[PDB]
Amino acid sequence: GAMGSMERASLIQKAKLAEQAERYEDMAAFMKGAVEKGEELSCEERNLLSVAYKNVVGGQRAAWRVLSSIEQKSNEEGSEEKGPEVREYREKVETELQGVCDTVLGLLDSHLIKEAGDAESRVFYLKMKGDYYRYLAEVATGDDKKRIIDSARSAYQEAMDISKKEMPPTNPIRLGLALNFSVFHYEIANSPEEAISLAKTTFDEAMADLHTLSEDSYKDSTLIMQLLRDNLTLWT
Amino acid sequence: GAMGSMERASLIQKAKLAEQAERYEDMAAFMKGAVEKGEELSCEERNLLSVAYKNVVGGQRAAWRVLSSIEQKSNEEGSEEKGPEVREYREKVETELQGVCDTVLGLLDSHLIKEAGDAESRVFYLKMKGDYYRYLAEVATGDDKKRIIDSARSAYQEAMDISKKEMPPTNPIRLGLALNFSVFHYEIANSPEEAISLAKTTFDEAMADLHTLSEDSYKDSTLIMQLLRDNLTLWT
Numbered sequence: 001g002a003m004g005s006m007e008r009a010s011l012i013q014k015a016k017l018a019e020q021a022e023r024y025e026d027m028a029a030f031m032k033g034a035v036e037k038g039e040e041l042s043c044e045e046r047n048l049l050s051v052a053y054k055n056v057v058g059g060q061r062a063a064w065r066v067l068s069s070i071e072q073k074s075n076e077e078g079s080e081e082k083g084p085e086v087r088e089y090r091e092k093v094e095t096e097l098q099g100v101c102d103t104v105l106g107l108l109d110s111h112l113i114k115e116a117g118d119a120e121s122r123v124f125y126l127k128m129k130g131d132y133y134r135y136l137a138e139v140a141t142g143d144d145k146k147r148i149i150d151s152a153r154s155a156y157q158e159a160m161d162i163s164k165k166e167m168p169p170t171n172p173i174r175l176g177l178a179l180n181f182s183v184f185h186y187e188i189a190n191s192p193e194e195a196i197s198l199a200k201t202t203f204d205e206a207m208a209d210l211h212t213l214s215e216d217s218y219k220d221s222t223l224i225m226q227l228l229r230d231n232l233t234l235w236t
Numbered sequence: 237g238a239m240g241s242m243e244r245a246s247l248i249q250k251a252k253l254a255e256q257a258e259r260y261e262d263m264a265a266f267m268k269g270a271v272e273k274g275e276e277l278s279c280e281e282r283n284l285l286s287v288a289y290k291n292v293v294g295g296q297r298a299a300w301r302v303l304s305s306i307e308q309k310s311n312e313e314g315s316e317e318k319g320p321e322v323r324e325y326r327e328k329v330e331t332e333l334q335g336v337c338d339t340v341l342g343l344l345d346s347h348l349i350k351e352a353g354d355a356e357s358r359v360f361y362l363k364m365k366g367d368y369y370r371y372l373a374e375v376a377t378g379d380d381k382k383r384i385i386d387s388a389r390s391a392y393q394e395a396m397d398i399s400k401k402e403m404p405p406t407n408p409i410r411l412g413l414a415l416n417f418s419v420f421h422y423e424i425a426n427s428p429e430e431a432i433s434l435a436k437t438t439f440d441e442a443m444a445d446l447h448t449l450s451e452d453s454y455k456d457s458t459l460i461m462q463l464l465r466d467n468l469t470l471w472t
């Protein structure tokens with residue numbers, strides 16, 4: 001552990017500085033170090049962890065998509081062969097992406113999830129587990145892919161079950177979970193009808209609970225409701 | 237050398253793929269490997285080297301500026317102390333930036349510059365040498381800073397002398413060199429009058445040579461002339 005000699009609070013402070021500097025690889029390493037101190041994470045600290053790795057893996061996913069599309073064009077009728085380079089480099093990026101996902105999943109399994117007893121922390125971590133298996137699924141091929149997809153589905157489902165019992169329908173954690181599980185259904189599981197039904201039921205049940213919220217909470221919830229509606233517009 | 241086992245042509249191909257994927261750290265490592273094969277670089281290959289390291293160091297400069305400004309606020313009248321973290325992290329980024337600059341300068345010195353006999357390659361490499369000493373100067377403090385500034389000035393000046401003898405006034409390499417040397421004068425050397433005079437003389441002498449150019453070359457030259465005029469507007 002390269003961050004083993006740095007104070008937990010210093011790691012959190014530096015993660016925040018790295019976010020400001022848009023240094024997301026540094027931010028992720030600092031938050032990994034904070035997690036490995038072994039104490040539970042606060043709401044703010046959980047969000048820092050999520051922001052850091054979402055940005056890192058997002059860059060890798062974008063690059064992998066560019067490279068995979070070049071690779072697929074290179075393996076089409078009428079292409080003159082270029083040799084192994086495109087495949088090799090896509091494999092390099094893919095391997096780096098898988099390693100980031102494995103790192104996050106390792107943090108959740110050792111030992112964030114098992115110590116998370118409150119609904120807000122447990123749903124948050126289980127949503128993350130679903131997300132990073134979903135990113136693994138995006139680059140997986142074969143039976144391989146089926147066990148990874150089922151791991152994503154299981155994590156999302158446990159998170160959904162808890163959120164429906166323990167959180168109101170406008171809770172932003174609950175809404176963001178349903179948003180991402182709906183994307184899983186549409187993009188990974190080949191279940192567009194399940195995706196649309198989940199996004200619609202989630203939107204409608206939040207709409208009916210908005211009257212209970214303050215102005216600030218209303219803004220938080222309607223923001224994510226708009227993302228659900230954007231997807232339904234794209235999907236229907 | 238981690239790229240010692242990869243073919244030169246494969247390194248160039250992968251640099252181009254990395255550019256497409258906006259993976260500039262990879263692009264720079266691939267081009268470093270290509271340079272270390274020991275053969276001279278073509279015009280296209282020189283541009284790939286420059287693009288890669290400009291993007292890498294640009295990210296570091298942007299982050300260093302964010303962190304240094306936070307550090308300066310933290311050391312002002314009325315700030316409550318936060319401890320060593322801001323300084324430590326700015327120093328980390330600074331050290332990483334200096335290492336990238338040192339790497340580029342090492343490639344130029346071993347042995348790109350000494351083998352560059354044509355005006356287009358020699359001016360290109362000497363401009364690069366001025367640029368990466370200028371980036372070192374931006375974070376340097378003290379006497380330290382004076383020797384680094386003089387190294388930047390010397391490189392830019394040798395490049396200017398060659399470009400004035402060997403290239404027409406609209407040559408994009410010559411124009412980009414004059415642009416960057418003018419920025420050196422304004423931002424590093426505390427010589428705004430020298431900056432303005434150089435940018436104005438460079439613009440006016442290119443304007444008078446535009447009639448000699450094709451439509452495509454006219455577009456290339458006027459693009460950089462606009463950058464010179466943008467700076468003069470900012471500076472006067």
Ligand SMILES: O=C(COc1ccccc1P(=O)(O)O)NCc1ccccc1
Binds near residue numbers: 179
């Ligand atoms: O189509 C997508 C999906 O985005 C969404 C949308 C809604 C919820 C979650 C995600 P997700 O957790 O990010 O998938 N693209 C995102 C992307 C892809 C490549 C690089 C960077 C970002």
Ligand SMILES: O=C(COc1ccccc1P(=O)(O)O)NCc1ccccc1
Binds near residue numbers: 294298367415416419
């Ligand atoms: O003020 C500048 C100077 O830009 C110019 C302008 C004209 C010529 C060269 C440069 P330069 O070789 O890039 O300095 N900002 C650039 C920057 C700073 C931080 C991060 C990324 C980019």
Ligand SMILES: [Mg+2]
Binds near residue numbers: 007008
């Ligand atoms: Mg301690």
Ligand SMILES: [Mg+2]
Binds near residue numbers: 091094095
């Ligand atoms: Mg693979």
Ligand SMILES: [Mg+2]
């Ligand atoms: Mg249902």
Ligand SMILES: [Mg+2]
Binds near residue numbers: 243244
């Ligand atoms: Mg060979």
Ligand SMILES: [Mg+2]
Binds near residue numbers: 327330331
């Ligand atoms: Mg220093």
Ligand SMILES: [Mg+2]
């Ligand atoms: Mg003069």
